[PDB]
């Protein structure tokens, strides 16, 4: 019964390894987590993230 | 080898009917359907047929957008004429545009005054002929001394259109290939 | 297996590199690019000559302009081309410093690559050192927003003279710095200020000397009047001092539609009727303009001939063929708006100008109009001169760099004091924290410290002073005293305190030197395989 917001931040932290972001991941992980949450859960689209 | 190709290549849809009684139907009608489809494409491409007397704001569209056409790279040739009524060669070139416009309906024929075209253009350099195609200038032609000058004829203008890739060499509309009916009549009698 | 062994096309031209030796060429390749622009840093710099393939020549010292339009082969130098450019587009200053600072991080990082530390772990040390360096600079940063507009007016000169001092424009730094400051006074809103950079135009004419350059308020045109018999200088009369400048999109021509059309002309009755149609059109045309009361009319396209004379009769000059992009800028300064058509022309949409004159330039057959405004208007246009084509381009670029430096002061009033003072201040901050946080990344903090020291040592090298006495004095003095505005005096003054020398730099400009450098070098260090397909 954990929170849903912290789930996306926890799993996205693994993706930001092996890149130029891993030290700046504290600020940019909030961007993609808040970005995808604005999308509709039923209809998640890949072209709206240009 | 060429004797077999001349039966189909050197005959239009009107001339292919000569071989209806001699040659096989399946050999002839297979090519007539091909040539009939090519005739239909030229009719759809016949978007022009008279000189478009334009003005500048429009140049930025008529001359160039057209040159893109469909943009299937459906390019369109656009012959521009920077006219100058004081010059004698300009009025000659204006007559060639209207004559060629009635024949070649797929090619766009554009005319505009030279004083309105370019800021402070040299009057000595007029008349000027520009040829656009897909937005690019294919030929920036100078006054008609290359094309005979004052003695320019319709045959010389049609030959220039073949050089820039606007009209095919073996086109039946060109005066070089469009032999008179009396000429072909004498050939059949003397054959 | 056969003798052919192919996986990808064109294996002969494609060649890989790997190992420690492959990375060694990358940092040493940056030294060749850095060493070229190392002498051009500071006020004692020297320009570089550029030659294009088309034969056009230009001279400059800006690092982005040097590296731009240059034929390159290695990929790492092309990243430095995009670097300097980065700082230029956003900031417009520090293009040589970010490349030298980026090369300094790479030079200090090679020693460490030689010991057995992984390259990504080295970049992690610079990130903690860079955030601690900028955080410490923010702590000792002074703000000038509390002062009034009078004292704040002076601070723009202290920073405008800094960037103009490192160019060839510095023969009169007091004179030309007012040009860069007075242009921004006319666009600032005086509260939650925005620069509105697009209004500020910039054009320079090749002619005369640079001392004759004077700032104007208007628009510079590179074209003549419709007829040369018109008067050159046009003044207003008894009332309505604004000249009522009418701006037009459609020129003086016959009306006709865009689509193809043929007007069927009947027998002689219709032929004589159409002669009265256009003759009454021009009479309706000139009555419409005189009803509006305009004194100057400009169209983007040329008027007809008959039309050029009809305007000349009523004392109504006209300019013709004004560029479409240039037409919009005239309406903003004159506090007007462009009419779509002539039927909507009225008094409210006309312009306002103090005076205009047709300026001659020697024996050349060209004409330039110079619009001037007595009161503070919206836009402003620079008027640069010089005795060469490239020196005007250099003055335009030197003024453009100063125009972007003062642009940062408007959006961000928090400034710093560079010239070796910020570098030595940020170098000892990470050094004092290195021995507290030994760990394994202490060598990365020391490499970041020594990398920052290359900038004031470069200024000491170009100025001729001893780097030993200069570096030892700054390290010993700044460790003793807390005042952090002492740096390398390059002009040879007796005092190194920069309060009296009138030098100021922005915080956003000096910050981007460290950020774009430390973020690039992470990418440079992470390359292992290097494949270059030969052209
Ligand atoms: N008169 C001066 N006194 C002290 N320091 C100066 C003086 N002029 C320039 N500097 C310093 O030298 C540096 C030179 O920067 P500059 O070369 O103009 O930018 P870029 O390196 O992008 O071309 C500035 O950051 C400034 O700190
Ligand atoms: Mg500078």
Q: Is C408 helix (H, G, I), strand (E, B) or coil?
A: helix
Asked if residue B127 has a cis previous peptide bond (ω within 30° of 0), the answer is yes
| Whether C380 contacts C199, CB under 8 Å | yes
Sign of CA dihedral C23, C26, C30, C31: positive
CA B168 to chain CA centroid, nearest Å: 9
| Whether C498 contacts C483, CB under 8 Å | no
Sign of CA dihedral C323, C326, C332, C333: negative
**Rounded CA separation B98/B52 (Å):** 10
**Rounded CA separation C188/C194 (Å):** 6
CB of A42 within 8 Å of any CB in chain C?
Answer: no
Looking from the CA of C101 toward its CB, the CA atoms found within 13 Å total: 30
Given phi > 0 = left and psi -120 to 50 = alpha, else beta, which region is C16?
A: beta
| Whether C501 contacts C156, CB under 8 Å | no
DSSP C384-421: E-BSSHHHHHHHHHHHHHHHHHHHHHHH--EEE--TTH
CA C289-C326-C353 angle, 5° bins: 50
**C162 C-alpha vs ligand 1 centroid, how far in Å?**
6
**Rounded CA separation C404/C90 (Å):** 9
**C94 C-alpha vs ligand 2 centroid, how far in Å?**
6
Beta strands in B19-163 (DSSP E): 52-53, 77-83, 108-113, 128-133, 136-141
**Rounded CA separation B139/B79 (Å):** 10
CA B109-B112-B114 angle, 5° bins: 130
Contact B119 C223 (CB under 8 A): yes
Angle, in degrees to the nearest 10, between helices C95-115 and C19-36: 150
Give the DSSP H/E element, type plus range, for residue C176: helix C173-185
- Which of C98, C419, C499, C516 should be mutated for ligand 1, with most atoms under 8 A from CB? C419
Contact A20 C124 (CB under 8 A): no
Q: Is C298 helix (H, G, I), strand (E, B) or coil?
A: strand
Give the DSSP H/E element, type plus range, for residue A36: helix A25-38
DSSP class of B17: G
Burial class (CB in 10 A: 0-12, 13-18, 19+), C261: exposed
CB neighbour burial string for B102-133, b if at least 16 within 10 angstroms, e if fewer = ebbbbbbbbbbbbbbbeeebeeeebbbbbbbb
Looking from the CA of A18 toward its CB, the CA atoms found within 13 Å total: 3
**Rounded CA separation B117/C327 (Å):** 18
**Rounded CA separation C486/C417 (Å):** 8
The catalytic site residues of C sit at 62, 95-96, 401
Nearest chain C alpha carbon to B58:
C258
**Rounded CA separation B148/B154 (Å):** 11
Segments making up each domain of chain C, as ranges: 1-144+414-535, 145-217+378-413, 218-377
Contact C301 B119 (CB under 8 A): no
**Rounded CA separation C102/C448 (Å):** 10
**Rounded CA separation C471/C460 (Å):** 9
Measure Cα distances from C463 to B44, B73, C143, C252, C411 in Å: 75, 62, 30, 63, 33
- Which of C92, C417, C418, C502 should be mutated for ligand 1, with most atoms under 8 A from CB? C418
Rounded to the nearest 10°, the torsion over CA C130, C131, C133, C135 is: 160
Q: Token pair of C33, please? A: 């690019």
**C459 C-alpha vs ligand 2 centroid, how far in Å?**
13
| Whether C84 contacts C96, CB under 8 Å | yes
**Rounded CA separation C47/C61 (Å):** 4
Measure Cα distances from C252 to C310, C336, C338 in Å: 11, 21, 16
Give the DSSP H/E element, type plus range, for residue C384: strand C380-384
**What CATH homologous superfamily does A1-50 map to?**
TCP-1-like chaperonin intermediate domain (3.30.260.10)
Segments making up each domain of chain A, as ranges: 1-50
Measure Cα distances from C98 to C84, C161, C192, C366 in Å: 7, 21, 30, 43
In chain C the first and final C-alpha atoms are separated, in Å, by 30
| Solved using | cryo-EM
**Rounded CA separation C137/C151 (Å):** 24
**Rounded CA separation C403/C92 (Å):** 9
N residues, chain B: 191
**Rounded CA separation B80/C244 (Å):** 39
User: What is the greatest pairwise CA distance in chain B?
Assistant: 66
Q: Is C159 helix (H, G, I), strand (E, B) or coil?
A: helix
**Rounded CA separation C76/C82 (Å):** 10
**Rounded CA separation C104/C454 (Å):** 7
Looking up tokens 């037009």, which residue turns up? Answer: C248
Backbone angles phi, psi at C184, to 5 degrees: -85, -20
Instruction: Select from C472, C465, C467 the least CA-distant residue to C494.
Output: C465
Instruction: Select from C97, C62, C80 the least CA-distant residue to C422.
Output: C97
Lining ligand 1 with CB less than 6 A are C 41-43, 62-63, 93-97, 162-163, 165-166, 418-419, 490-491, 501, 503, 505
Q: Across the strands, what pairs with C49?
A: C59
Instruction: Select from B69, B81, B67, B46 the least CA-distant residue to B132.
Output: B67
Chains that touch C (3 or more CB pairs under 8 A): A, B
Looking up tokens 């009369």, which residue turns up? Answer: C237
Looking from the CA of C272 toward its CB, the CA atoms found within 13 Å total: 3
Q: Token pair of C262, please? A: 């043929």
Q: Token pair of C395, please? A: 């003055």
In sequence order, which ranges of C61-144 are alpha helices (DSSP H)?
63-67, 75-90, 95-115, 119-139
Contact B116 C258 (CB under 8 A): no
Measure Cα distances from C238 to A27, B61, C241, C260, C375 in Å: 65, 46, 8, 49, 19
Measure Cα distances from C439 to C178, C225, C430, C450 in Å: 52, 76, 14, 19
**Rounded CA separation B7/C228 (Å):** 69
């Amino acid at each position: 019964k954990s929170s849903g917001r912290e789930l996306l931040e926890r799993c996205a932290r693994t993706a930001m390894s092996s890149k130029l972001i891993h030290n700046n991941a504290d600020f940019f992980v909030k961007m993609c987590v808040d970005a995808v949450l604005s999308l509709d859960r039923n209809d998640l689209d890949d072209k709206l993230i240009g | 080898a060429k004797q077999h190709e001349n039966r189909l290549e050197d005959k239009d849809l009107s001339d292919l009917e000569e071989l209806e009684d001699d040659e096989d139907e399946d050999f002839l009608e297979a090519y007539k359907i091909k040539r009939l489809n090519e005739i239909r494409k030229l009719q759809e491409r016949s978007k022009f047929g008279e000189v478009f007397h334009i003005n500048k704001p429009e140049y930025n569209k008529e001359v160039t957008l057209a040159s893109q056409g469909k943009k299937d790279d459906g390019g369109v040739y656009v012959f521009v004429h920077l006219s100058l009524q004081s010059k004698l060669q300009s009025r000659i070139l204006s007559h060639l545009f209207q004559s060629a416009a009635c024949k070649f309906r797929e090619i766009k024929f554009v005319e505009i005054p030279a004083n309105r075209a370019i800021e402070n253009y040299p009057e000595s350099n007029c008349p000027t002929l520009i040829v656009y195609y897909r937005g690019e200038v294919i030929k920036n032609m100078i006054t008609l001394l290359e094309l005979g000058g004052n003695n320019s004829k319709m045959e010389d203008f049609e030959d220039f259109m073949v050089k820039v890739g606007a009209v095919a060499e073996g086109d039946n509309r060109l005066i070089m290939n469009r032999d008179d009916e009396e000429s072909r009549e004498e050939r059949k009698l003397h054959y | 297996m056969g003798r052919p062994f192919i996986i990808v096309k064109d294996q002969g031209n494609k060649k890989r590199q790997h190992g420690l030796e492959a990375k060694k060429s990358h940092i040493l390749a940056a030294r060749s690019v850095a060493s070229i622009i190392k002498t051009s840093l500071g006020p004692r710099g020297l320009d570089k000559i550029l030659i294009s393939p088309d034969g056009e020549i230009t001279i400059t010292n800006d690092g982005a302009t040097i590296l731009s339009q240059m034929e390159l082969d290695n990929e790492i130098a092309k990243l430095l081309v995009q670097l300097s450019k980065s700082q230029d587009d956003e900031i417009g200053d520090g293009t040589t410093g970010v490349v030298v600072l980026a090369s300094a991080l790479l030079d200090q990082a090679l020693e460490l690559i030689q010991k057995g530390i992984h390259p990504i772990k080295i970049a992690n040390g610079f990130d903690e050192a860079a955030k601690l360096a900028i955080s410490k600079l923010e702590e000792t940063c002074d703000d000038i927003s509390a002062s009034n507009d009078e004292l704040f007016r002076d601070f723009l000169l202290r920073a405008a003279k800094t960037s103009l001092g490192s160019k060839i424009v510095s023969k009169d730094h007091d004179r030309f710095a007012e040009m860069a400051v007075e242009a921004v006074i006319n666009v600032m809103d005086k509260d939650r200020k925005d620069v509105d950079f697009d209004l500020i135009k910039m054009q320079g004419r090749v002619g005369g000397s640079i001392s004759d350059s004077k700032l104007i308020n208007g628009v510079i045109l590179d074209k003549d009047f419709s007829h040369p018999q018109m008067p050159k200088c046009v003044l207003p009369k008894e009332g309505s001092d604004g000249v009522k400048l009418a701006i037009l999109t459609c020129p003086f021509e016959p009306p006709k539609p865009k689509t193809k059309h043929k007007l069927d002309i009947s027998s002689v009755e219709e032929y004589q009727k159409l002669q009265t149609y256009e003759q009454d059109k021009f009479k309706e045309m000139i009555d419409d303009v005189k009803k509006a009361g305009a004194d100057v009319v400009i169209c983007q396209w040329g008027f007809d001939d008959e039309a050029n004379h009809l305007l000349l009769q009523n004392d109504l000059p006209a300019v013709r063929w004004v560029g479409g992009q240039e037409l919009e800028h005239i309406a903003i300064s004159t506090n007007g708006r462009i009419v779509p058509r002539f039927q909507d022309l009225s008094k409210d949409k006309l312009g306002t100008c103090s005076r205009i004159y047709e300026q001659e330039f020697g024996t050349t057959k060209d004409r330039m109009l110079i619009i001037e405004q007595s009161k503070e208007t919206k836009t402003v246009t620079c008027f640069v001169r010089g005795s060469n084509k490239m020196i005007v381009d250099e003055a335009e670029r030197a003024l453009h760099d100063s125009l972007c430096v003062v642009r940062n002061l408007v959006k961000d009033s928090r400034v710093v004091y560079g010239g070796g003072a910020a570098e030595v201040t940020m170098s000892l901050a990470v050094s004092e924290e290195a021995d507290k946080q030994r760990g394994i990344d202490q060598y990365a903090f020391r490499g970041f410290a020594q990398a920052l020291d290359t900038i004031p040592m470069t200024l000491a090298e170009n100025s001729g002073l001893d780097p030993i006495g200069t570096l030892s004095t700054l390290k010993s003095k700044q460790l003793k005293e807390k005042i952090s505005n002492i740096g390398v005096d390059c002009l040879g003054y007796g005092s190194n305190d920069m309060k009296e020398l009138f030098v100021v730099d922005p915080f956003i400009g000096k910050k981007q030197q460290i950020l774009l450098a430390t973020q690039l070098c992470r990418m440079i260090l992470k390359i292992d395989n290097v494949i270059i397909s030969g052209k």
